[PDB]
Scaffold this active site. Structure first.
Site, PDB file in Angstrom:
ATOM      1  CD  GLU A   1      -0.377 -12.698  12.854  1.00  0.00           C
ATOM      2  OE1 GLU A   1      -0.456 -13.652  13.662  1.00  0.00           O
ATOM      3  OE2 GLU A   1       0.021 -12.831  11.674  1.00  0.00           O
TER       4      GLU A   1
ATOM      5  CG  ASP B   1       2.476  -0.935   3.223  1.00  0.00           C
ATOM      6  OD1 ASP B   1       2.318  -2.025   2.619  1.00  0.00           O
ATOM      7  OD2 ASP B   1       2.454  -0.828   4.464  1.00  0.00           O
TER       8      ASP B   1
ATOM      9  CG  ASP C   1      -3.077   1.675  -0.399  1.00  0.00           C
ATOM     10  OD1 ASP C   1      -3.926   2.531  -0.030  1.00  0.00           O
ATOM     11  OD2 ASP C   1      -2.867   0.611   0.228  1.00  0.00           O
TER      12      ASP C   1
ATOM     13  N   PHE D   1      -3.762 -10.844   4.032  1.00  0.00           N
ATOM     14  CA  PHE D   1      -2.951  -9.745   3.502  1.00  0.00           C
ATOM     15  C   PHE D   1      -1.436  -9.942   3.703  1.00  0.00           C
TER      16      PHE D   1
ATOM     17  NE  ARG E   1      -4.478   2.989   4.500  1.00  0.00           N
ATOM     18  CZ  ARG E   1      -5.332   3.798   3.883  1.00  0.00           C
ATOM     19  NH1 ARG E   1      -5.825   4.863   4.514  1.00  0.00           N
ATOM     20  NH2 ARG E   1      -5.716   3.542   2.643  1.00  0.00           N
ATOM     21  CG  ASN E   2      -0.121   2.685   2.785  1.00  0.00           C
ATOM     22  OD1 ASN E   2       0.062   1.873   3.688  1.00  0.00           O
ATOM     23  ND2 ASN E   2      -1.185   2.599   2.033  1.00  0.00           N
TER      24      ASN E   2
ATOM     25  CB  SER F   1       2.811 -11.463   9.171  1.00  0.00           C
ATOM     26  OG  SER F   1       1.641 -12.155   9.571  1.00  0.00           O
TER      27      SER F   1
HETATM   28  C1  LIG Z   1       5.565  -3.371   5.732  1.00  0.00           C
HETATM   29  N1  LIG Z   1       5.623  -2.002   5.231  1.00  0.00           N
HETATM   30  C2  LIG Z   1       5.577  -0.935   6.221  1.00  0.00           C
HETATM   31  C3  LIG Z   1       6.713  -0.891   7.213  1.00  0.00           C
HETATM   32  C4  LIG Z   1       8.068  -0.517   6.845  1.00  0.00           C
HETATM   33  C5  LIG Z   1       9.074  -0.487   7.766  1.00  0.00           C
HETATM   34  C6  LIG Z   1       8.788  -0.828   9.112  1.00  0.00           C
HETATM   35  N2  LIG Z   1       9.565  -0.881  10.193  1.00  0.00           N
HETATM   36  C7  LIG Z   1       8.760  -1.273  11.235  1.00  0.00           C
HETATM   37  C8  LIG Z   1       7.488  -1.467  10.814  1.00  0.00           C
HETATM   38  N3  LIG Z   1       7.487  -1.189   9.458  1.00  0.00           N
HETATM   39  C9  LIG Z   1       6.473  -1.215   8.505  1.00  0.00           C
HETATM   40  C10 LIG Z   1       5.970  -1.732   3.954  1.00  0.00           C
HETATM   41  N4  LIG Z   1       6.457  -0.660   3.389  1.00  0.00           N
HETATM   42  N5  LIG Z   1       6.616  -0.989   2.032  1.00  0.00           N
HETATM   43  C11 LIG Z   1       6.222  -2.213   1.900  1.00  0.00           C
HETATM   44  C12 LIG Z   1       6.161  -3.038   0.688  1.00  0.00           C
HETATM   45  C13 LIG Z   1       5.492  -4.260   0.725  1.00  0.00           C
HETATM   46  C14 LIG Z   1       5.409  -5.056  -0.404  1.00  0.00           C
HETATM   47  C15 LIG Z   1       5.987  -4.662  -1.613  1.00  0.00           C
HETATM   48  C16 LIG Z   1       5.876  -5.528  -2.824  1.00  0.00           C
HETATM   49  C17 LIG Z   1       4.580  -5.851  -3.241  1.00  0.00           C
HETATM   50  C18 LIG Z   1       4.364  -6.652  -4.355  1.00  0.00           C
HETATM   51  C19 LIG Z   1       5.437  -7.143  -5.078  1.00  0.00           C
HETATM   52  C20 LIG Z   1       6.733  -6.842  -4.693  1.00  0.00           C
HETATM   53  C21 LIG Z   1       6.943  -6.042  -3.577  1.00  0.00           C
HETATM   54 CL1  LIG Z   1       8.576  -5.691  -3.135  1.00  0.00          CL
HETATM   55  C22 LIG Z   1       6.648  -3.431  -1.646  1.00  0.00           C
HETATM   56  C23 LIG Z   1       6.736  -2.631  -0.516  1.00  0.00           C
HETATM   57  O1  LIG Z   1       5.790  -2.757   3.080  1.00  0.00           O
END
Ligand SMILES: CN(Cc1ccc2nccn2c1)c1nnc(-c2ccc(-c3ccccc3Cl)cc2)o1
Length: 270
Positions: A28, A167, A149, A29, A153-154, A31
């Site tokens: 839970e 991320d 970033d 920026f 953690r990313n 979810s």
């Molecule tokens: C949530 N996360 C991590 C993650 C991945 C995989 C996973 N599996 C279990 C849990 N997990 C957690 C993640 N990794 N990359 C992203 C991301 C988020 C947003 C965007 C974006 C931002 C602005 C405009 C357009 C876009 Cl596409 C790009 C990449 O988010």
């Protein structure tokens, strides 16, 4: 056809909401939720679904535009965007990612120092993590894409234990000296964040600069102080991470240079 390329990328990135089934909340920026994605082959795929936040036109089109650029990335050490979804309120976008059961690299490093989760991570694997991130970052900088970033953690762990950068920006102790002062960001600022990320890996998840507060960081770096060599860390590895924190961003090596230095160091291990 210069614009027709953006229209091509645009058609590709959108997923039909009916092909997506949402599961439980993971974080839970916006979810993070688990999901099921119905593929072209008739089978469902386990996915991670990131929901986001204020204008219903310009900022939404901006999200689609940014997502269209992101889905164009194709490297084994860069997270792959599977697509995007839009949901309206009573203007909420969703980004669809491969599900990573092993989670983020920072949590994994920390868990490795506790009896239950992953076992002690040896030097070769810590170096393999650094090589993998350097490869993903090298792919990105060569396409002129700034992460903005980069931190442990990313970075995500795939099922085969391969690290991928994820991320993407939009964390003071990951920010380069010139980015704190001149509010300017380049690939050399990503190289600085990478050195800090390498230090997080080598310390197995320590917060950068123990005993230095966030509001003390610019003055700390300004006086020439950098992250200390971790205990039992190779001098060659520390020289590589230290090279990422050279005051002059032009003196910092590229990701391609770093990736090569890290691969040679890894191969040199018995
Ligand atoms: C949530 N996360 C991590 C993650 C991945 C995989 C996973 N599996 C279990 C849990 N997990 C957690 C993640 N990794 N990359 C992203 C991301 C988020 C947003 C965007 C974006 C931002 C602005 C405009 C357009 C876009 Cl596409 C790009 C990449 O988010």
């Amino acid at each position: 056809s210069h614009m027709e390329e953006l229209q091509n990328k645009l058609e590709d990135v959108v997923i039909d909401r009916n092909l997506l089934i949402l599961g439980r909340i993971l974080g839970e920026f916006g979810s993070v939720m688990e999901g099921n994605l119905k593929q072209e082959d008739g089978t469902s795929l386990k996915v991670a679904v990131k929901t986001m936040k204020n204008s219903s036109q310009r900022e939404i089109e901006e999200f689609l535009s940014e997502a269209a650029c992101m889905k164009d990335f194709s490297h084994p050490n860069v997270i792959r965007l599977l697509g995007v979804c839009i949901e309206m309120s009573s203007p909420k976008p969703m980004v669809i990612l491969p599900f990573m059961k092993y989670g983020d690299l920072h949590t994994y490093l920390l868990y490795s120092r506790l009896e239950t989760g992953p076992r002690h991570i040896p030097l070769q694997t810590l170096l393999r993590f650094m090589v993998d991130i350097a490869l993903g970052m090298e792919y990105l900088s060569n396409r002129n894409f700034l992460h903005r970033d980069l931190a442990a953690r990313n970075c995500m762990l795939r099922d085969d234990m391969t690290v991928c950068v994820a991320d993407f920006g939009l964390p003071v102790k990951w920010i380069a000296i010139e980015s704190l002062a001149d509010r300017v960001y380049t690939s050399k600022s990503d190289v600085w964040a990478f050195g800090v990320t390498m230090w997080e890996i080598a310390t197995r998840g320590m917060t950068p600069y123990p005993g230095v507060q966030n509001h003390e960081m610019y003055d700390y770096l300004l006086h020439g102080h950098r992250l200390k060599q971790p205990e039992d860390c190779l001098d060659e590895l520390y020289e590589i991470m230290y090279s990422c924190w050279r005051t002059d961003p032009l003196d910092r090596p590229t990701f391609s240079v770093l990736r090569l230095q890290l691969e040679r160091l890894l191969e040199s291990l018995p």
